[PDB]
Design a protein around this nucleic acid. Structure first.
Lengths: 52, 52
RNA sequence: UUUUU
RNA sequence: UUUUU
């Protein structure tokens, strides 16, 4: 963290589609939802795709 | 005198000209209708419930 | 543009 | 597609 010139989001913006397909698979097996919506109260199990 | 249902002179899409895409060996594909839908879930899920 | 624990 | 106590 102390060794990037812009911020952390501004570097991790690459790693988008890899975890996308990740959650597609392991959601297709089982009803996973991440954290970030469960604090914010999403509704649709389908829309885990973008609770980043 | 006899013949088949499907044809070749039919109006069909074409990647390039000679290519015919809906390959006409699909005479034998009629699974159950509801078995294909989304309104019924999948066999894997049906297994993992039965195992959990 | 930043600021979402 | 969800939402039928």
């Amino acid at each position: 963290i102390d060794h990037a010139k812009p911020t952390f989001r501004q570097i991790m913006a690459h790693f988008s589609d890899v975890a996308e397909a990740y959650i597609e698979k392991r959601n297709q097996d089982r009803p996973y939802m991440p954290r970030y919506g469960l604090q914010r109260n999403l509704t649709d199990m389908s829309l885990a795709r973008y609770a980043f | 005198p006899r013949l088949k249902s499907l044809t070749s002179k039919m109006r069909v899409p074409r990647y390039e000209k000679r290519v015919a895409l809906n390959l006409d060996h699909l005479i034998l594909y009629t699974p159950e209708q509801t078995d294909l839908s989304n309104t019924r879930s999948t066999r894997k899920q049906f297994d993992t419930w039965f195992e959990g």
